[PDB]
Every structure is written in structure tokens, then in C-alpha cells.
Amino acid sequence: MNPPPPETSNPNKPKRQTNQLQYLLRVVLKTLWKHQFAWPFQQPVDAVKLNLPDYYKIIKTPMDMGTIKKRLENNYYWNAQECIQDFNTMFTNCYIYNKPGDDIVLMAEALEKLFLQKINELPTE
């Protein structure tokens, strides 16, 4: 069973655009998206499709790059750190749901390294 995907809009929450957020979409996300190991992370985990009936029994704060992309496109975030936290939640979810050495974990590990490389330096405000 699948819960609703994470919100990509919220009228109670203030919107913002910054140079760093623009960069997170244009450069960081859109480059990671093209990586050979990006595909498991491009949409919310579908526990019915993927036959992971316990996915959402284990993962209580799901996150994926499809959601992050939409949030960035919608100016959902206040700042870059908020967006960066979503990427980190996505990676840690993978390490939590699986186990060390798994192919899926090797994929997340490679993506996380590339992610860190790209956010090491962000544009100035």
C-alpha cells in the first residue's frame, strides 16, 4: 500500500526563489537525473509495482527526485538547505530500507557522492 506522494505545493507555506535554489534545479538535480544510477530515485517508490509491501511500513519520510524537481519548479522551498535536506532524506531512506552492499545502496552511494561534489560550491546570493 502506497500513501499519497509528498506534497509539491502547500498554500500555508511561503514560497521563495534564490540563486542557490535555481542552481539546485538547473545544475544539481538536472545533472544527477542523467546519471546511469538515477532511475530508481526519479519517482516515489510504488510498493505495489515494485513488490515492496513493507516500504512505507519502514520509511516514514519518503522522498525522491521527482518530488524534489517539482518542489523546485514550484518554488516550494524557502532556501537551498531545505532542498538539500530532501536529497539527504532520499539517500538515507535508501540506506535504511536496504542493507550495506546491496546494488540499490551502491547506486544511492554513487549518487550521493556526485551530489556532494556539486553542492560543495553553490552560487552566491
Ligand SMILES: O=C(CCC1CCCCC1)Nc1cc(NS(=O)(=O)c2cccs2)cc(-c2csc(=O)[nH]2)c1
Ligand atoms: O524505481 C524502480 C523503477 C523505476 C522505473 C525505471 C524506468 C522504467 C520502469 C520503472 N525500481 C525499483 C526497484 C527496486 N527493487 S529491485 O530489486 O528491482 C532493485 C535492486 C537494485 C536496484 S533496483 C527498488 C527500488 C528502490 C528505489 S529507492 C529504494 O530503496 N529502492 C526501485
